[PDB]
Coordinates of C-alpha atoms and ligand atoms in Angstrom, one line a residue:
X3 CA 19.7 -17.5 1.3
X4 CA 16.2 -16.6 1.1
X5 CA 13.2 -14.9 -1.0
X6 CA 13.3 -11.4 0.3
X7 CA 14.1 -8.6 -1.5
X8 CA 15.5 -4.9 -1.6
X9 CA 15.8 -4.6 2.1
X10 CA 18.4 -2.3 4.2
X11 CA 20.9 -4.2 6.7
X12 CA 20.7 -2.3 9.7
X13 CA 22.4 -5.3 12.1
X14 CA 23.4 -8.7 11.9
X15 CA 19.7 -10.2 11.6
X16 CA 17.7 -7.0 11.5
X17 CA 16.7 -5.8 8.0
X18 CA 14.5 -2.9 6.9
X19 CA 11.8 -2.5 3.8
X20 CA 9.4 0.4 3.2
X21 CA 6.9 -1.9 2.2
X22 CA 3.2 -2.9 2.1
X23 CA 3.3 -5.7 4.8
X24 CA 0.2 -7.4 3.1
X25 CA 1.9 -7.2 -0.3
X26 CA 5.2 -7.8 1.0
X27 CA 3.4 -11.7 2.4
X28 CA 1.5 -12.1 -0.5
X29 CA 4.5 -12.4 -2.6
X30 CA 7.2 -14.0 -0.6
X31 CA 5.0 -16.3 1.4
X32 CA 7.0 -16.5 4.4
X33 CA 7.1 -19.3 6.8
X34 CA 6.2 -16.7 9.5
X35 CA 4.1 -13.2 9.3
X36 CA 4.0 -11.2 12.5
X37 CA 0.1 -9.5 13.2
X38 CA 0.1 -6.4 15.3
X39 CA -2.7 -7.5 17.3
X40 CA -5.1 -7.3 20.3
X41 CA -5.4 -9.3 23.3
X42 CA -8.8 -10.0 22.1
X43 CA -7.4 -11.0 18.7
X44 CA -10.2 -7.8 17.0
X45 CA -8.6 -7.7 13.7
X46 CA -10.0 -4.0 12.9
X47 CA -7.6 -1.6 11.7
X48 CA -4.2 -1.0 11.7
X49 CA -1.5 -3.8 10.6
X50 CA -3.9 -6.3 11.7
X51 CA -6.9 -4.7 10.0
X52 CA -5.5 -4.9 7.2
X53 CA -3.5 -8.7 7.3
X54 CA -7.6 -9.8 8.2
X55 CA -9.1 -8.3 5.3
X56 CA -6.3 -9.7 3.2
X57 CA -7.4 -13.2 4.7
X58 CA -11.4 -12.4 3.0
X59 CA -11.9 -12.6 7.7
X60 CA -10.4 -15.9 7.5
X61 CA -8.1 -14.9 10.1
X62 CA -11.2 -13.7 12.5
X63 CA -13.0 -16.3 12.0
X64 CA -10.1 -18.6 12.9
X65 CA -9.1 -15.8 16.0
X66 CA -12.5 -15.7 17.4
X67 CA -12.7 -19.8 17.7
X68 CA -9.3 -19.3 19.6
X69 CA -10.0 -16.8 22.3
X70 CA -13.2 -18.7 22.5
X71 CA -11.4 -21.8 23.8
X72 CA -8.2 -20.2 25.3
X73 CA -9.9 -16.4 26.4
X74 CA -7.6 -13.1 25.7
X75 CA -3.4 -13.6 25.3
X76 CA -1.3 -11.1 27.4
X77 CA -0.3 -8.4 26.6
X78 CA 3.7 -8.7 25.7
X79 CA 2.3 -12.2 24.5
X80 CA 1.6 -14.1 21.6
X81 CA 0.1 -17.2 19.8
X82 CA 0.5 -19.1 16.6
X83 CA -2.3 -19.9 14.4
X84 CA -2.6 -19.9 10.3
X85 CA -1.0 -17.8 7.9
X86 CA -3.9 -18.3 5.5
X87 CA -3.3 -16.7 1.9
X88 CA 0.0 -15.4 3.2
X89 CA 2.1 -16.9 4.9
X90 CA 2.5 -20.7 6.5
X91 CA 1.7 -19.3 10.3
X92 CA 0.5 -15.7 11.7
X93 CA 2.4 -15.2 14.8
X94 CA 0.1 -12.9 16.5
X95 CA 2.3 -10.5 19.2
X96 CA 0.2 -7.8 21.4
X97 CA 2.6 -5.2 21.9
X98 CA 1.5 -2.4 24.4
X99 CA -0.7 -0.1 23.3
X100 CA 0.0 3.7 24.5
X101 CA -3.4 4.7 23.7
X102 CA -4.7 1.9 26.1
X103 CA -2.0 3.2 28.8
X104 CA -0.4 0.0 28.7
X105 CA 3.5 0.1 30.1
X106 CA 6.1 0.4 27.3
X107 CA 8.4 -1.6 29.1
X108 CA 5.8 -4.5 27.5
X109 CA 7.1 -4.1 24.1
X110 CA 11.0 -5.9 25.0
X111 CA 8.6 -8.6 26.4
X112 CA 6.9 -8.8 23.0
X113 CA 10.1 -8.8 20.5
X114 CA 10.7 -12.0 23.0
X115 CA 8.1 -13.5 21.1
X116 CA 10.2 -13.5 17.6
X117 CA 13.2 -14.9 19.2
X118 CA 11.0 -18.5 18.8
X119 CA 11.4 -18.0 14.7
X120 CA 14.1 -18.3 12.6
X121 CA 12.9 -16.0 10.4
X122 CA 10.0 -13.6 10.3
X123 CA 8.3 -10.7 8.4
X124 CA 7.0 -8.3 10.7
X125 CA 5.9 -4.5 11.7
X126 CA 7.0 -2.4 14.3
X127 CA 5.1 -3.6 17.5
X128 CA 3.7 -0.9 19.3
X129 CA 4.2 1.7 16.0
X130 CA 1.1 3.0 14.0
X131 CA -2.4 3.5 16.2
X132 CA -0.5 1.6 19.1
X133 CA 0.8 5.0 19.6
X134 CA 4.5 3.8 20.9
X135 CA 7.6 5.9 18.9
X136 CA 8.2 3.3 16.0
X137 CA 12.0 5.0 16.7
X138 CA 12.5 3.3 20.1
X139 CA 10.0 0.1 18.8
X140 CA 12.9 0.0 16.0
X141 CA 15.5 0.3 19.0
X142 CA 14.3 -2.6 21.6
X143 CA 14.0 -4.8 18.1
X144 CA 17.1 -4.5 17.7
X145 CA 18.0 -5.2 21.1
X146 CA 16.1 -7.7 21.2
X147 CA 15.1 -9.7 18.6
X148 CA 18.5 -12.4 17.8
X149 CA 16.7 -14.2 15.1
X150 CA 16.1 -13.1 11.2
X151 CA 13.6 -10.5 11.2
X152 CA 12.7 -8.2 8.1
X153 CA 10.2 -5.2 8.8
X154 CA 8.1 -3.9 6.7
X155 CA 7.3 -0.4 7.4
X156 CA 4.2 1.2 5.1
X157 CA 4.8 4.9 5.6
X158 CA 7.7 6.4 3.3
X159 CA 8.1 9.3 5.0
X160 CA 8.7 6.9 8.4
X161 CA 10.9 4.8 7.0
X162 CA 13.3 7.5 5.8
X163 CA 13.5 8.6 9.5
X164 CA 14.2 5.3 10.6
X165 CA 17.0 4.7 8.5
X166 CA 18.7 8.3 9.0
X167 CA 18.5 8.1 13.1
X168 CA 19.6 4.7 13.8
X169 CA 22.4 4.4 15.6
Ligands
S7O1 C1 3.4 1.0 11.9 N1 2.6 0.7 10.8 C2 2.4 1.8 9.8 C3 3.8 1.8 9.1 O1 4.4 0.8 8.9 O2 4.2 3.0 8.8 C4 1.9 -0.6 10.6 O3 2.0 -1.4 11.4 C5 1.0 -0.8 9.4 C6 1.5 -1.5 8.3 C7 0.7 -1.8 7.3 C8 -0.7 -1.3 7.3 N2 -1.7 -1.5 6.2 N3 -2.8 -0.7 6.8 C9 -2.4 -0.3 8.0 O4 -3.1 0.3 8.8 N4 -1.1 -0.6 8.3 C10 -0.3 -0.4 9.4

């Protein structure tokens, strides 16, 4: 048993939220919350914009010190540093970015990442101004991810889609 609530069972450990990913953290605290980020670690906008605001920059001050010792992660790769004021750890997973003309075969590589965790809240790699279908990110989750994962998707509209085509 655990502390999150009013989620959708799509499989056997993926569930489904429309939720406020910065809110959702806030208030269940979880061991592990998954940033949409950067191979640079640039927390500007989207998902990760917004965890890093939540953090008062606390997580780019801590992600600048990192890729200043280690330089920029892969992409399909990830690293775990603090969760700050909302979660224990940030697991930080660069999923391809379509606008970047990065290969979408990348994003199986990053749900890899969340196989490491028992349990996780996360976004849709790749979904929002990644620019990948959040339908087939929601797919190669699925197919991918074997541990707990609970996604919290902002966009209402969105999440009603994602729920009515899954197969
Ligand atoms: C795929 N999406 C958008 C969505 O879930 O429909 C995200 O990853 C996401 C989640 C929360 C959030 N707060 N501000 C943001 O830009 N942002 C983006």
């Amino acid at each position: 048993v655990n502390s999150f609530s009013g989620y959708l069972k799509l499989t056997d450990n993926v569930y489904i939220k429309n939720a406020d990913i910065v809110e959702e953290a806030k208030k269940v605290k979880p061991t592990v919350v998954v940033n949409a980020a950067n191979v640079y670690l640039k927390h500007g906008g989207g998902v990760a914009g917004a965890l890093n605001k939540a953090t008062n920059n606390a997580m780019q001050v801590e992600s600048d010190d990192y890729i200043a010792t280690n330089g920029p992660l892969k992409v399909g790769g990830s690293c775990v540093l603090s969760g700050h004021n909302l979660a224990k750890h940030c697991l930080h997973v660069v999923g391809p970015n379509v606008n970047k003309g990065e290969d979408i075969q990348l994003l199986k590589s990053a749900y890899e990442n969340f196989n490491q965790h028992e349990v996780l809240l996360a976004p849709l790699l790749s979904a929002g101004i990644f620019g990948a279908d959040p339908i087939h990110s929601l797919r190669v989750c699925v197919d991918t991810v074997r541990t707990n994962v609970y996604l919290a998707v902002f966009d209402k509209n969105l999440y009603d889609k994602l729920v009515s085509s899954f197969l």
